[PDB]
Write a protein that binds this ligand. Structure first.
Ligand SMILES: O=C(NCCCN(CCCCN(CCCNC(=O)c1cccc(=O)n1O)C(=O)c1cccc(=O)n1O)C(=O)c1cccc(=O)n1O)c1cccc(=O)n1O
Ligand SMILES: [La+3]
Length: 176
């Protein structure tokens, strides 16, 4: 029982796909240097801490994806599987049945140079509500003003206001 009001997910026609996606070069550790989405809210009481996501390419060409977060003085690990979709750089969540209320989960790599930065679009339908987010990944915990401005411009092109765009604060715990 609830009421919720969400910015509509953009059509996938507004979400570019990285041309010539190289699955092997996308592997390894990425820091989440920016987050934007219809359920992302800027919060000054506890500013969002940086977390890291590790992509491991399996023999079957799916990714094992592990996120590491620092929560309540401990390292929290979330492991899931990204299964190759219709085109290189697109994925769906493996074993969708195992997530209560989840009916769809889509991943699209928008842009990357593999060795510094990536932007990744996520869309999911959970309890019949449609959520989307854009993750700005860095190989380091800092990125240039130009890459952050490009991320803001792309996020606003998908209908997100300033207060749905956050830059998690770098930490050392868990993600080094
Ligand atoms: O709107 C989105 N995200 C921003 C709000 C995050 N949040 C704020 C506290 C969440 C803290 N955790 C979650 C870590 C553990 N999670 C899970 O065991 C999990 C199970 C099933 C589906 C799923 O998605 N997760 O994460 C993250 O920091 C975290 C790290 C890495 C990847 C990641 O995805 N998350 O969230 C939410 O509670 C939330 C609200 C609405 C939808 C939603 O999926 N989540 O997690 C969104 C849109 C489209 C796809 C998508 O996956 N997400 O998250
Ligand atoms: La999530």
């Amino acid at each position: 029982d609830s009421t919720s009001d969400l910015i509509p997910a953009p059509p996938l026609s507004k979400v570019p796909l990285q041309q010539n996606f190289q699955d092997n070069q996308f592997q390894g550790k990425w820091y989440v240097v920016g987050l934007a989405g219809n359920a992302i809210l800027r919060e000054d009481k506890d500013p969002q801490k940086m977390y890291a996501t590790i992509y491991e390419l399996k023999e079957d060409k799916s990714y094992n994806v592990t996120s590491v977060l620092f929560r309540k003085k401990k390292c929290d690990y979330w492991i899931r599987t990204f299964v190759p979709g219709s085109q290189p750089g697109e994925f769906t969540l493996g074993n969708i049945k195992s997530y209560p209320g989840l009916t769809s989960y889509l991943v699209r790599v928008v842009s990357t140079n593999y060795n510094q930065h990536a932007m990744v679009f996520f869309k999911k339908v959970s309890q019949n509500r449609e959520y989307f987010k854009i993750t700005l990944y860095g190989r380091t915990k800092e990125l240039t003003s130009e890459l952050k401005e490009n991320f803001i411009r792309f996020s606003k092109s998908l209908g997100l206001p300033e207060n749905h765009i956050v830059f998690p604060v770098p930490i050392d715990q868990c993600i080094d």
